[PDB]
Symmetry: D2
Subunit: 493 residues, 4 copies
Amino acid sequence: SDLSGVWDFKLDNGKGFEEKWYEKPLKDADTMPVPASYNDLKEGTDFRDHYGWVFYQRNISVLRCAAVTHYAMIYLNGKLICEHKGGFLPFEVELNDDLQDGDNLLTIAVNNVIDYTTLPVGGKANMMPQNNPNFDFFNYCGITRPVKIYLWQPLNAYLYKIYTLPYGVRSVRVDGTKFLINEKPFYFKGYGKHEDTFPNGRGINLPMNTKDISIMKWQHANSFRTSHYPYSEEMMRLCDEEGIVVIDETTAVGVNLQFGGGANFGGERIGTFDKEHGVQTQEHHKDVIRDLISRDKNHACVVMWSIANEPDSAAEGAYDYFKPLYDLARELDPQKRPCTLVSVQGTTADTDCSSQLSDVICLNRYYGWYFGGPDLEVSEIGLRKELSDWGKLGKPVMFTEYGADTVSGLHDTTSVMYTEEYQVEYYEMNNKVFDEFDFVVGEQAWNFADFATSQSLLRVQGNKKGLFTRDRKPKMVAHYFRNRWSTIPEFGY
Amino acid sequence: SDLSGVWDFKLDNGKGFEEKWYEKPLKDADTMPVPASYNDLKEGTDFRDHYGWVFYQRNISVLRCAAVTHYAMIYLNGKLICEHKGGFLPFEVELNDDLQDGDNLLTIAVNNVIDYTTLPVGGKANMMPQNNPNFDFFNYCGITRPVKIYLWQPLNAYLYKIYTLPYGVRSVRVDGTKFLINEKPFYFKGYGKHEDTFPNGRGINLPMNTKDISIMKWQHANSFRTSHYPYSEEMMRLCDEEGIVVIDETTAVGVNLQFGGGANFGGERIGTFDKEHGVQTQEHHKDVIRDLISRDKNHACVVMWSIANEPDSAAEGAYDYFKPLYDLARELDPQKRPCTLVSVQGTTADTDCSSQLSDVICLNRYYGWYFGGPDLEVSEIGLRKELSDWGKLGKPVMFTEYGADTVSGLHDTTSVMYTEEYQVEYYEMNNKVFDEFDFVVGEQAWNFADFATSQSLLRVQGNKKGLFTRDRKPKMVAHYFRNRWSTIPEFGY
Amino acid sequence: SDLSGVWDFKLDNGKGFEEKWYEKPLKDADTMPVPASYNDLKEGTDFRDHYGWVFYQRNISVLRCAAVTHYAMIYLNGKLICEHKGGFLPFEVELNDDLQDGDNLLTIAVNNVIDYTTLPVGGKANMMPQNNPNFDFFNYCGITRPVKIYLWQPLNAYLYKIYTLPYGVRSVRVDGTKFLINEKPFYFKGYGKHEDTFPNGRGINLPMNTKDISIMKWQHANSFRTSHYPYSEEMMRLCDEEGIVVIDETTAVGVNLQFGGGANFGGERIGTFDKEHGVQTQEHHKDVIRDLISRDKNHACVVMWSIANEPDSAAEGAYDYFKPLYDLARELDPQKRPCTLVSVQGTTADTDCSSQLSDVICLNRYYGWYFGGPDLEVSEIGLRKELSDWGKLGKPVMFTEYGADTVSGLHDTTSVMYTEEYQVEYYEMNNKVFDEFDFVVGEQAWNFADFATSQSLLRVQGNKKGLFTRDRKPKMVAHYFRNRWSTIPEFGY
Amino acid sequence: SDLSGVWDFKLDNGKGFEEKWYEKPLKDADTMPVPASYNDLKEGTDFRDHYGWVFYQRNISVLRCAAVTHYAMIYLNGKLICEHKGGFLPFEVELNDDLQDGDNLLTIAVNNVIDYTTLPVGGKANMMPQNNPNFDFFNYCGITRPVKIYLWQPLNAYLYKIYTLPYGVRSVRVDGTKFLINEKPFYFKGYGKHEDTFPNGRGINLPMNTKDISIMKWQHANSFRTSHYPYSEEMMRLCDEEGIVVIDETTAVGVNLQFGGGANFGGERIGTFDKEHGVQTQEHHKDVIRDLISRDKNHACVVMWSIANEPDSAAEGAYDYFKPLYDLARELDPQKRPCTLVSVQGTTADTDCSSQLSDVICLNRYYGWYFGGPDLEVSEIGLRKELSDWGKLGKPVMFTEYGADTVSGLHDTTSVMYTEEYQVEYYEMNNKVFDEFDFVVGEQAWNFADFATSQSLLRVQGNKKGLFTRDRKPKMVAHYFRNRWSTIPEFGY
Ligand SMILES: CNc1ccc2c(n1)sc1c(N3CCN([C@@H]4O[C@H](C(=O)O)[C@@H](O)[C@H](O)[C@H]4O)CC3)nc(NC)nc12
Ligand SMILES: CNc1ccc2c(n1)sc1c(N3CCN([C@@H]4O[C@H](C(=O)O)[C@@H](O)[C@H](O)[C@H]4O)CC3)nc(NC)nc12
């Protein structure tokens, strides 16, 4: 029985836990539908940028939270039943006990604070009393996912059935510079995505998920990556049904304290993996890895794991941080699927700890935007120079992010940055260099669609690097990729 | 237990009922989330404009359809359990019988054909093998609403509780030219709405519903009308919680065969209420009235009933068609709430059968757009001339529709039609005349937000008359109304 | 010596000619730059839509009007020196006499009234006290063009020199179904243009002219048509320098009283060439033909004459109206260049008087917009059916107009009318049928850029059929044509 | 006699002066209209971003350059006649000599290089082989202005006449904290402008000038500033006719080497007024001051001089640089008009050398954008704190720049940066603080309209801080200012 609906809702002030609001029904309360991120569902900056706790509550009568972002505190008649740290993976509690009679009071308290102990991690200032994300997307929070009571081929799916669980048969493993599904040389076509819609924020959107898949099949794409967090269970099963290759990724974005900017302790900047003042996320990072792999163990669409997005991988302490997490990933994946991490700009093949730990090299490069733009010729020289050097490893290289901010509507015959023409030229140059090297095994544009971020001078009402707008309407670049991807097969490219 | 999820889906070809698809599991099937309109969830004109039947199916293990648009045909292991005509109101069936063991096959067949027998009615051509709506919104179909197994004051709501059902205490009745809630002279502030979002089509959107309410409270609005169909049960309860005045309306739009255009039988145009060739919707019209009132009997937000939107009310046979439906409305409303109908342009106080049957006169006037535009001065003369004549009845007059198509982004200091400036000037002129007459008891703009329609030369990617865009972003007119409505109280204006 | 600058300016009230304003300096006067259309240079609908006369004036000290739209009345110290009817071709007067001493008073009175006696002709209502154009562009008026005192190959121009006059050598003549320049089979690539910029209105814009040419060479175009009026002398010489093929056209648009709509005399609609109540433009039509050809006699870019745009050519009296004008065109063109007229939708090869008089058949067809849209398949059947029938004449057929209104920014993966995707699909279908017939010798899209029109429900802030916006920014269709035209040569296609 | 037209044109390669192109007619030449900036009149980044010299040429038969940006080199039959450094003020040469017979060859060579010796000054990198402007507008170059051969009250102009020269009588002088025109306390209402249109670049646009004035009178504005360079003579006379208060400004923008960024000599950053490595513009700065004041000596609209825009005025050497230029300004202004300079963010009353030299304090502050955004509350605290401190001087304070980048079309009910709502809120906060202090004597928004800049991550297709778009269409903020300025008089506020 799904508990999804409009619940009672109130923000803490913060004299909430003192007055024991989880015992009595909330007075002067608001309304809020679940599942949904609450940030965009009321008006006013003080509500959207609220710092602290919120109180959901709903009656019951006669429990698995699919996701609660970030920190959940479940109650019943006042007695705490659960606690959970981790805003993008499910958790459940037993309720045979503590469920009195009929008319009972279920309260869910949700916290949004992010720091060096959370995944994603929150910095102390802007990346590009308040939360300051160390990541480039908005800190949507609340009960994002529902609360309920209780040969396979890319683009050519076939799932047998087996509680009933669907399953698809497929082999995936890496040989040299080749990514093989069912022993055939695959090429990744697609994007890095976001669970981002209006006004749901990060709340699950089954209609948009299907529309996203239809658009991808319209665009002749085959893959995407769950940047920068594991998606909903329903979206994963859909890729199983629809035959969409997925790269599952953990909530480990922002373990890199070189943005912006930086953080100082004693008049000196601190490194990322400083044991005393740096990140305190390791033991939670593996908790997320073992919780993720336990969830999507059997999804034939899951093809490769991503331990972290854009970490300080070329810094002191980077190897000793990721080695125990990498090993764990191979330890609990019964299929021994490839594992990787997506690398920031500035990483080279020699300095990246991913050069050894990862089966596949996954790059996030912005030659022609953050680097070199608007000089596409100079940026081409650099992209080729770094890409040649990455071939020294004899591993598959894969671009997981590359893009240019483009506001839909801006045009010029002599293109400039932020126009739709410049975006197509940016991708033309990059794709031209990608086609020169036989060890690249995929292109994944950033982003699939425009998505909301925190406010800054460098973000024009969110991140505009999508091929599509936030309402999924195509920019000119979306028709460019559709034509290019129509001549690039899934296997043998 | 909510059955909402992604189901199996296929379109009929139309050799579907022959091959008995409702018995065996569907081969070569697609995917489709419910609840949602399917029209926008795949790509291609042939899918969006599909004519005929679609087949939903979902397994069961151990039934109330909140809405199925338009015609539902429920199955189980092959045996038909139900049929329902009526795309916007709930229906249920008993399932103690016919539910074998555990693993069973629930199939829902949905038809989209509209004609002179349906509400809404479908014409034979464009209003402004295919369905041609006699109404100005898109023919979204599918399982729009979920399938599940089992003193009050405006803007100041208070609902006692009482199965548990919430209830709010309030008095509503008409005295002379005054609309009184709790014996105080009310003024309607708001819009005509639509259940229209992307990509859900008409599918229920609990996030957008709350965002809509927040925007209305941001804009200092108090009311809206369920144009042109009854909304979801969840949206009605939200207006109860949030204290939003609602005008409940039936699915009776398009009982007017003077659009465009017209229909001919024997070389001669036929009237609307021709008994042989005209509308065949009467007995279904009261079925909808008795089904609607049975659903929202106790919603304190429901304040007035609307029997039909824009009917041929000044034509022969109009009185004898609406008299038995009007009487029924007063017969089954235990509160004796006011009843009305919203009148097309061209109606006068003398010729409208609503002049006698309705407690409140509800007008849809476009002085300054369809009539007179771009001459706002001439259009002002006409609006005053017709409005003065409507005062002869000593009844409350209320504008339920007035607006000008405005594409967000188009501006000029010397305004022209379709720009944001012209839209504000259009509303300034109209509102100026409204303030001259003490018998007008409300203004409701058309529309609240841009919504999808059928394609025509006169529709610029849908209906653009919204104060907000389809993604709820405000046009300049939305800030004009917010300032005007901030100085107009709920009572005593 | 150029008199171009900001002059004194005032609108008549209309007690202007009584008070003899042309004698004394204008009191309570405004400012206005020449050359420019005055309509958009002040604010307010009453100024933009002004009906009647305006008064320019400027001092002199010690005369050829390049164009005065429409009717000019030149003065000096009060004494009338000139009168001119014809808003788009030059006229001059002698000034040795009437020029006293030094400080003198030059007044130019300009009228904007259009009716059945003017070219372009003004109707009595909207086409789709006030001027109501029988043409689809705005009635910009004022001193549009400056007032001053005193082998060639397409895309490969070479002009010898010869008062000094430049000249280019080239042969043009029609053989069968072939348009030959220098005895090679040409193909027209380009558009119908407009002298339309902001805020100049129709005023000459030498910067935009060069930018237009650069954009055409960027788009791999070779031709355009001076729709619907002869352009400036400077623009013609530029096409001589830049090697751009031009189709010179007269001011004869709107000699067709079947728009909208129509005009009635005695309870009955009147035909276009009714001698008593219809058009009274014939003797002025040849005055324009002999004035035009006298101006561009030597422009090597002028390749074909266009007697009228979209006339009632399949109606009674159409042949006897155009025969004396056609003959005149061949009489005064010392090069015997081809002559034609562009035909409205609904014209067939049998009924069009252009089927006999014209050397080249020039069609304005909207299969997929005005006809058939949004059914591109049905519209394709019609375009092929009419195009096949036009081949019966053994003449060259050329499309001078075809397009779909497109507001820059509107997109959908499943296209609908007014989006950028639908515009590309519209042109794809049309161009596919054009490539099936060897007797079509050119495609000219409508329009090159968005331009201002009179206000109506069918015009979304002007005409949006341009491949480019009014500020020359490209829509998606502009890159489609650039790719298609890059593979289509000038000769031998 | 105006030489304005389309000339021969070619870019140097750079073997141009060797081959003596100024002697023979240019082979393989292009076309270019004058007056106009050439940068946007052809296609391709290599043309728009061309570094070096361009060659204009035009025949003559039987000379004052109104502006040539930046460096002019005039020829005739090969013999150099002139040289001029200074891209925004007129210069002339005698031609009785050197003018042979009739058919002669006039060549104008134009250079675009900017460095520490030019005004405006060019840096070595981006401010926010190539020119890198130290200013926030595009380096438009070419023959921008024409080449030719030969009581007053704000908003209530009256000019007597007096070669004939118009003149207007008015008194202007500063008393305490009051700016008085005709001994009445004035308040500046308006903006900082730019000579920026499409596609003319910085080329003179008499139509747009009049449209700009009409829009200002529509918006109830009274003043603007010639940021950041003296405008055309025609625009100045128009403000005389139309009664628009102007603040004339020199070409002295970018004398501040703290942008971005900075420049290093020997591993150390150099100060702005370093005599050896810093700016070398002083003696040219006064040449511009004495050339400017010699031009607009008699314009009654000129009300105050601006010596430089945003200089390093709080740095070592700043006082000794501006003292001789300031004194010169009072030396040659026969009216002893006030003189000032507009100050960068970060300047305080104590450290600004303008605190002593200037009669009026002119600030460029961005509280709520560059500083504090999106925290409008915190930014309000700062604006009040700095504004209170500026009152210690007992002088008039005037804001010459304040604004937020706004892309037309972006909206949200809960505003974020770059939307139209945030722009209105930004101006509401600022204007609220301005109204608290009686010593502020004007508000001038930045900018009047969107204008082109060099490309950077921080510039969304140019500078979007305009109240209007580049095609003069109003954003929502333009209607906010129109309402505010309608209640603020010219005198006595
Ligand atoms: C097959 N079914 C139908 C039914 C009605 C009509 C048509 N087809 S076609 C047409 C029309 N046109 C007038 C304009 N003409 C060109 O079209 C451009 C544009 O419309 O954009 C114009 O800008 C340009 O100046 C013109 O040369 C094209 C024909 N006018 C009116 N008046 C009610 N009705 C119709
Ligand atoms: C308080 N915290 C900070 C931090 C950094 C900066 C500021 N405040 S302020 C500023 C700046 N400005 C330069 C431009 N100047 C005006 O602004 C207009 C515009 O920016 O739109 C311009 O179009 C117009 O021409 C100019 O007169 C305004 C100052 N430049 C740079 N270079 C990295 N940094 C900063």
